[PDB]
Amino acid sequence: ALEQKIAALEQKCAACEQKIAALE
Amino acid sequence: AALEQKIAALEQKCAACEQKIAALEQK
Amino acid sequence: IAALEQKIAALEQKCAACEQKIAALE
């Protein structure tokens, strides 16, 4: 399913905006 | 449906993800 | 749906090494 593929990316990139912002 | 929206939200969230990581790498 | 399939593939490619590069930078 597509629902499961979206869920996997959602988990994968759960805190990357925050972590990049912290590195910055 | 719900799905299209969850996809759009991800597209927006990680819009600049890769370019900022690269800027961080370069600097 | 055919587009939704394509858009998901697009994000999987975009952020393929994303978490690994962040971890390394940290």
Distance CA C25, CA A16 (A): 12
Cα B16–A15–A10 angle (5° rounding)? Answer: 85
Mutate to test the interface with A, among C5, C6, C7, C11 (most CBs of A within 10 A): C11
Instruction: Tell me the C-alpha to C-alpha distance, in Å, between residue B21 and each of A11, B9, B12, C19, C26.
Output: 19, 20, 16, 10, 11
Q: Resolution of the experimental model in angstroms, please?
A: 1.9
Domain segments of chain B: what residues?
A: 1-27
**Smallest Cβ distance to C19: which of A2, A5, A16?**
A16
A13 at interface of C, judged by CB pairs closer than 8 A: yes
